[PDB]
Enzyme design. Structure first.
Site, PDB file in Angstrom:
ATOM      1  N   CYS A 279      32.207  33.699 -16.393  1.00  0.00           N
ATOM      2  CA  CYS A 279      31.665  34.954 -16.879  1.00  0.00           C
ATOM      3  C   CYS A 279      32.049  36.095 -15.954  1.00  0.00           C
ATOM      4  CB  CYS A 279      30.141  34.934 -16.925  1.00  0.00           C
ATOM      5  SG  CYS A 279      29.460  36.483 -17.596  1.00  0.00           S
TER       6      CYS A 279
ATOM      7  N   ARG B   7      29.000  39.121 -14.601  1.00  0.00           N
ATOM      8  CA  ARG B   7      27.905  38.752 -13.689  1.00  0.00           C
ATOM      9  C   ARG B   7      27.307  39.863 -12.807  1.00  0.00           C
ATOM     10  NH1 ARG B   7      30.076  33.389 -11.083  1.00  0.00           N
ATOM     11  NH2 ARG B   7      32.152  34.053 -11.845  1.00  0.00           N
TER      12      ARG B   7
ATOM     13  N   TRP C 279      26.711  41.804 -24.065  1.00  0.00           N
ATOM     14  CA  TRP C 279      27.505  42.679 -24.920  1.00  0.00           C
ATOM     15  C   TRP C 279      28.972  42.304 -24.701  1.00  0.00           C
ATOM     16  CZ3 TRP C 279      24.102  45.006 -21.195  1.00  0.00           C
ATOM     17  CH2 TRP C 279      24.727  45.349 -19.980  1.00  0.00           C
TER      18      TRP C 279
ATOM     19  N   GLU D  20      37.838  40.585 -25.901  1.00  0.00           N
ATOM     20  CA  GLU D  20      37.387  39.368 -26.607  1.00  0.00           C
ATOM     21  C   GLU D  20      37.636  39.472 -28.115  1.00  0.00           C
ATOM     22  OE1 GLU D  20      33.494  37.538 -25.133  1.00  0.00           O
ATOM     23  OE2 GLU D  20      33.353  39.581 -24.313  1.00  0.00           O
TER      24      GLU D  20
HETATM   25  C1  HEM Z   1      26.189  41.670 -20.097  1.00  0.00           C
HETATM   26  C2  HEM Z   1      27.391  41.605 -20.682  1.00  0.00           C
HETATM   27  C3  HEM Z   1      28.302  40.370 -20.533  1.00  0.00           C
HETATM   28  C4  HEM Z   1      29.639  40.420 -20.550  1.00  0.00           C
HETATM   29  C5  HEM Z   1      30.534  41.688 -20.692  1.00  0.00           C
HETATM   30  C6  HEM Z   1      30.123  39.063 -20.413  1.00  0.00           C
HETATM   31  C7  HEM Z   1      31.443  38.700 -20.378  1.00  0.00           C
HETATM   32  C8  HEM Z   1      31.919  37.435 -20.617  1.00  0.00           C
HETATM   33  C9  HEM Z   1      33.242  37.094 -21.090  1.00  0.00           C
HETATM   34  C10 HEM Z   1      34.368  38.102 -21.418  1.00  0.00           C
HETATM   35  C11 HEM Z   1      33.295  35.751 -21.188  1.00  0.00           C
HETATM   36  C12 HEM Z   1      34.480  34.858 -21.610  1.00  0.00           C
HETATM   37  C13 HEM Z   1      34.291  34.584 -23.094  1.00  0.00           C
HETATM   38  C14 HEM Z   1      35.489  34.008 -23.800  1.00  0.00           C
HETATM   39  O1  HEM Z   1      36.657  34.155 -23.327  1.00  0.00           O
HETATM   40  O2  HEM Z   1      35.223  33.406 -24.889  1.00  0.00           O
HETATM   41  C15 HEM Z   1      32.026  35.209 -20.766  1.00  0.00           C
HETATM   42  C16 HEM Z   1      31.729  33.872 -20.668  1.00  0.00           C
HETATM   43  C17 HEM Z   1      30.497  33.361 -20.326  1.00  0.00           C
HETATM   44  N1  HEM Z   1      29.361  34.088 -19.989  1.00  0.00           N
HETATM   45 FE1  HEM Z   1      29.231  36.139 -19.966  1.00  0.00          FE
HETATM   46  N2  HEM Z   1      29.061  38.211 -20.228  1.00  0.00           N
HETATM   47  C18 HEM Z   1      27.899  38.953 -20.367  1.00  0.00           C
HETATM   48  C19 HEM Z   1      26.622  38.412 -20.336  1.00  0.00           C
HETATM   49  C20 HEM Z   1      26.312  37.054 -20.193  1.00  0.00           C
HETATM   50  C21 HEM Z   1      24.971  36.462 -20.256  1.00  0.00           C
HETATM   51  C22 HEM Z   1      23.675  37.252 -20.576  1.00  0.00           C
HETATM   52  C23 HEM Z   1      25.076  35.133 -19.994  1.00  0.00           C
HETATM   53  C24 HEM Z   1      23.958  34.050 -19.953  1.00  0.00           C
HETATM   54  C25 HEM Z   1      22.732  34.333 -19.485  1.00  0.00           C
HETATM   55  C26 HEM Z   1      26.497  34.861 -19.774  1.00  0.00           C
HETATM   56  C27 HEM Z   1      27.045  33.645 -19.458  1.00  0.00           C
HETATM   57  C28 HEM Z   1      28.301  33.239 -19.763  1.00  0.00           C
HETATM   58  C29 HEM Z   1      28.740  31.870 -19.818  1.00  0.00           C
HETATM   59  C30 HEM Z   1      27.927  30.585 -19.566  1.00  0.00           C
HETATM   60  C31 HEM Z   1      30.189  31.958 -20.191  1.00  0.00           C
HETATM   61  C32 HEM Z   1      31.137  30.774 -20.421  1.00  0.00           C
HETATM   62  C33 HEM Z   1      31.075  30.484 -21.914  1.00  0.00           C
HETATM   63  C34 HEM Z   1      31.934  29.292 -22.230  1.00  0.00           C
HETATM   64  O3  HEM Z   1      32.344  28.537 -21.308  1.00  0.00           O
HETATM   65  O4  HEM Z   1      32.216  29.110 -23.435  1.00  0.00           O
HETATM   66  N3  HEM Z   1      27.211  36.041 -19.835  1.00  0.00           N
HETATM   67  N4  HEM Z   1      31.217  36.262 -20.354  1.00  0.00           N
HETATM   68  C1  XFJ Z   2      36.461  24.337 -25.837  1.00  0.00           C
HETATM   69  C2  XFJ Z   2      35.544  25.416 -25.322  1.00  0.00           C
HETATM   70  C3  XFJ Z   2      34.904  25.265 -24.087  1.00  0.00           C
HETATM   71  C4  XFJ Z   2      34.059  26.278 -23.626  1.00  0.00           C
HETATM   72  N1  XFJ Z   2      33.427  26.125 -22.419  1.00  0.00           N
HETATM   73  N2  XFJ Z   2      33.895  27.404 -24.392  1.00  0.00           N
HETATM   74  C5  XFJ Z   2      34.522  27.559 -25.595  1.00  0.00           C
HETATM   75  C6  XFJ Z   2      34.325  28.762 -26.463  1.00  0.00           C
HETATM   76  C7  XFJ Z   2      33.900  29.928 -25.626  1.00  0.00           C
HETATM   77  C8  XFJ Z   2      33.576  31.118 -26.486  1.00  0.00           C
HETATM   78  C9  XFJ Z   2      34.316  31.394 -27.659  1.00  0.00           C
HETATM   79  N3  XFJ Z   2      34.012  32.498 -28.387  1.00  0.00           N
HETATM   80  C10 XFJ Z   2      33.022  33.339 -28.005  1.00  0.00           C
HETATM   81  C11 XFJ Z   2      32.275  33.106 -26.851  1.00  0.00           C
HETATM   82  C12 XFJ Z   2      31.170  34.074 -26.485  1.00  0.00           C
HETATM   83  C13 XFJ Z   2      31.411  34.548 -25.086  1.00  0.00           C
HETATM   84  C14 XFJ Z   2      30.452  35.613 -24.612  1.00  0.00           C
HETATM   85  C15 XFJ Z   2      29.125  35.297 -24.301  1.00  0.00           C
HETATM   86  C16 XFJ Z   2      28.250  36.291 -23.837  1.00  0.00           C
HETATM   87  C17 XFJ Z   2      26.798  35.926 -23.539  1.00  0.00           C
HETATM   88  C18 XFJ Z   2      28.748  37.609 -23.672  1.00  0.00           C
HETATM   89  C19 XFJ Z   2      30.124  37.855 -23.978  1.00  0.00           C
HETATM   90  N4  XFJ Z   2      30.680  39.088 -23.807  1.00  0.00           N
HETATM   91  N5  XFJ Z   2      30.933  36.863 -24.446  1.00  0.00           N
HETATM   92  C20 XFJ Z   2      32.538  31.975 -26.066  1.00  0.00           C
HETATM   93  C21 XFJ Z   2      35.359  26.572 -26.085  1.00  0.00           C
END
Ligand code: HEM
Ligand code: XFJ
Ligand code: HEM
Ligand code: XFJ
Ligand code: H4B
Ligand code: H4B
Ligand code: ZN
Lengths: 403, 404
Positions: free
Chosen positions: B108, B111, B280, B285
């Site tokens: 993420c 953070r 958000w 993305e």
């Molecule tokens: C506040 C605005 C936030 C922004 C701009 C943001 C941004 C992002 C982005 C760009 C990704 C990669 C997503 C992708 O490529 O599919 C991501 C992944 C992730 N974020 Fe955030 N985030 C935000 C808030 C949060 C919150 C509130 C949480 C949880 C409490 C969080 C936890 C995670 C986790 C666990 C991932 C990995 C998801 C996965 O492995 O599929 N983020 N974040």
């Molecule tokens: C195989 C696999 C593994 C893995 N860890 N995640 C994925 C999908 C991850 C994924 C795909 N589309 C959308 C999201 C949402 C990501 C997301 C989450 C939050 C909370 C904020 C933000 N800006 N973006 C996450 C796939």
């Protein structure tokens, strides 16, 4: 037990079995991954690397177990046992150099691996001779713009005597002159080498695109300075297909990307000077060289000339200018009839290489972070491709700067 | 030097050492022989030691380590496990744990916002209908008419031989993907399976490119039940471009709220199988992955054709030029509609600030370089030049197998 490797665009899966041939540890452990780090932090050992290598060579010419194969292993044993070291036959060196390139995980250009001109320069005894060999390499590789991959191999390291070294990191680079006010004129990445060249008696220019001289070092001697004949250094003026003012920026770049600071390891032997060259992928020049903030840093200049709103990130002025600068590099190389490859063509050909290597060897070591281009990552197929990174031998390795 | 990984920023030349990685109690997939960092996927004694660790983290964070209340909470936790096989978190322990899981998330980039997370406690929830109410409440609070707020809602934890709370959708808001007669897909090809599960469970499907999926929600030991999100709860943004007038005519749109619903929240060995969270968007993305991935909406060619680019050759950079414009359309359209969004320049600058805060607060920050660097213009952002160390710290979000 062997890693599963998945392509997320196509759903296809392979298993990497090649990684089990790795004899050398990388920087990662189960506690933490250090894959994004740019650098790492007796006769019995050499004998076994030599044997493995020789076995690799005979297997490549499908003569494993032959007479010649047995006698060659005997020669190696005999030489190591008497002298502590040994010497490669030219054909072995040629094979070893191609495998080192094949095995290089940061190289997106490996589909070309089998096509490498190898100059044997192991009969080199002076910095002067090094210069002649280097001039011949440049001439050959440049080929009036029709670039040809080449490596020149200088004499191996020997126990308790100094290495042959090229002090320059690339055979062709631009001077960086630290200025009165602490800005830099030219390439900021090359300030330290520029200063070495002057301190060894070079008369420096004061332009942004001054081709550096070579500092060449024969064992336990002070390095010697040699100016490259300007006619040998092919350069490409940069202009833009539609933006007529781009040419007035006075930008330019050199045709030949030639690495000269890495160590070539074959069969336990180390070649501390072994410069190699191919052709450019356009993002190295258009994105990194010209757009990195600690390099020529021209993004803002270009964006202003394009009249973009520079005041806010969200107008995406940087992205827009990066694209036009890359296009300008491609167009100019094409216009000057100098070999170049764009990052879409290169990564597509890399995907093909992955597939060839899968059938040939059961895997292919690759550093995802280096393979994915520095602009438009997910727009290229390598983004969506999982990769396994590990060290095979023969290998190119990084080494300490000679000073 | 220090016996910890040395981490360098190559743009600025500065060095730090990560000491936080020493706290990792869980192995990743790398070994000394091979790096697997680019791969997308990977009882009383065990629970107790994980529980004890988390409670020490909690008391440390309130500056009461070694205190009488700290030792009493420890004793209380072991006695609960001793007699029931499990234990329960206090409310403030849950808030802390949820924020820590986000803080600890290596993938993420957002953070810098970790301390600002609204934690809705839904550990009283006992039906699928009630999960729906809770989720609708979350969506309303989080969306806040476009002024988005980070939030997570935590449903009851996994229990000794009793079924899980599960949301079947991978996200709270996603578009349907409809497998066509000719093998192509209308809508989002990512969501064919979930679309087809919704239909089997009695959803009347639409047939647009942008139909919002219903939710399939599973309470313990029941089949999942289907719930249609009331459309006025799902904020969407029509996409237009600031100077390319034809772009609005393409009828593209995206939803405001990115809300992950399939991840497991683990805190002190306790497992929250349903704990949907949201923030958000970062604009890349939507504009780069969702809209331009070949296996997603795949609009790059259509947009390049509209822009009159030479799509017959790679070296025209038609792909790069179209992607930029689509990304600009995403940012412009969210900005116009007053819906919070952050571009990839501002997000990565803010993550660099976060790395420096965490260096001082904890001595490092687990980060996944391939995920933090955006999918367009990587090296134009400061994270590209920053070495990063990746490791698993708990509390954590983790991927879980699909419930079906
Ligand atoms: C506040 C605005 C936030 C922004 C701009 C943001 C941004 C992002 C982005 C760009 C990704 C990669 C997503 C992708 O490529 O599919 C991501 C992944 C992730 N974020 Fe955030 N985030 C935000 C808030 C949060 C919150 C509130 C949480 C949880 C409490 C969080 C936890 C995670 C986790 C666990 C991932 C990995 C998801 C996965 O492995 O599929 N983020 N974040
Ligand atoms: C195989 C696999 C593994 C893995 N860890 N995640 C994925 C999908 C991850 C994924 C795909 N589309 C959308 C999201 C949402 C990501 C997301 C989450 C939050 C909370 C904020 C933000 N800006 N973006 C996450 C796939
Ligand atoms: C034929 C055309 C070639 C192309 C298009 C190409 C492409 C590239 C690119 C884009 C990089 C990353 C460079 C960077 O970001 O600094 C690279 C790295 C590398 N390539 Fe190639 N390459 C070519 C030929 C060669 C040859 C001939 C060799 C050796 C014989 C070679 C060996 C290497 C090595 C060792 C690296 C990593 C260098 C380092 O770690 O600094 N490549 N290649
Ligand atoms: C810290 C550090 C580590 C490392 N392994 N390399 C570097 C610099 C690498 C580097 C910098 N400028 C230029 C190059 C040349 C790359 C190159 C080489 C060849 C043969 C072909 C081609 N297209 N490109 C390589 C830095
Ligand atoms: C920190 C990071 O590993 C470093 O910036 C890398 C990233 N990827 C790269 N990729 C290539 N091809 N060349 C580079 O110099 C780098 N730099
Ligand atoms: C193969 C590779 O690991 C995979 O495609 C990753 C690369 N980086 C990513 N980064 C983000 N933020 N999101 C992703 O889905 C991916 N995909
Ligand atoms: Zn690793």
């Amino acid at each position: 037990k062997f890693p599963r490797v998945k392509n997320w665009e196509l759903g296809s899966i392979t298993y990497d079995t090649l990684c089990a041939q790795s004899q050398q540890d990388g920087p990662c452990t189960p506690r933490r991954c250090l894959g994004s780090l740019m650098l790492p932090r007796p006769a019995e050992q050499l004998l076994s690397q030599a044997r493995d290598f020789i076995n690799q060579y005979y297997s490549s010419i499908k003569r494993s177990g032959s007479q010649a194969h047995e006698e060659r292993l005997q020669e190696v044993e005999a030489e190591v046992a008497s002298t502590g070291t040994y010497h490669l036959r030219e054909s072995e060196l040629v094979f070893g150099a191609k495998q080192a390139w094949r095995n290089a995980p940061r190289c997106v250009g490996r589909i070309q691996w089998g096509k490498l001109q190898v100059f044997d320069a192991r009969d080199c005894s002076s910095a002067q001779e090094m210069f002649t060999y280097i001039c011949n390499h440049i001439k050959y590789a440049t080929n009036r713009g029709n670039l040809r991959s080449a490596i020149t191999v200088f004499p191996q390291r020997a126990p308790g005597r100094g290495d042959f070294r090229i002090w320059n990191s690339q055979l062709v680079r631009y001077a960086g002159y630290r200025q009165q006010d602490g800005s830099v004129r030219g390439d900021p990445a090359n300030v330290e080498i520029t200063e070495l060249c002057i301190q060894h008696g070079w008369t420096p220019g004061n332009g942004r695109f001054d081709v550096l001289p070579l500092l060449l070092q024969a064992p336990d001697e002070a390095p010697e300075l040699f100016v490259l004949p300007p006619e040998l250094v092919l350069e490409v003026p940069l202009e833009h297909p539609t933006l007529e003012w781009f040419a007035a920026l006075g930008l330019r770049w050199y045709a030949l990307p030639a690495v000269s600071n890495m160590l070539l390891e074959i069969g336990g032997l180390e070649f501390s000077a072994a410069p190699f060259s191919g052709w450019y992928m356009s993002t190295e020049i258009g994105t990194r060289d010209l757009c990195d903030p600690h390099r020529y840093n021209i993004l803002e200049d270009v964006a202003v000339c394009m009249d973009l709103d520079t005041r806010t990130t969200s107008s995406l002025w940087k992205d827009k200018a990066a694209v036009e600068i890359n296009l300008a590099v491609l167009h100019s190389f094409q216009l000057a009839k100098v070999t170049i490859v764009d990052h879409h063509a290169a990564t597509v050909s890399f995907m093909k290489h992955l597939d060839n290597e899968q059938k040939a060897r059961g895997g292919c070591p690759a550093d995802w972070a280096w393979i994915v281009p520095p602009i438009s990552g997910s727009l290229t197929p390598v983004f969506h491709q999982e990769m396994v990174n590990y060290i095979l031998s023969p290998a190119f390795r990084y080494q300490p700067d000679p000073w």
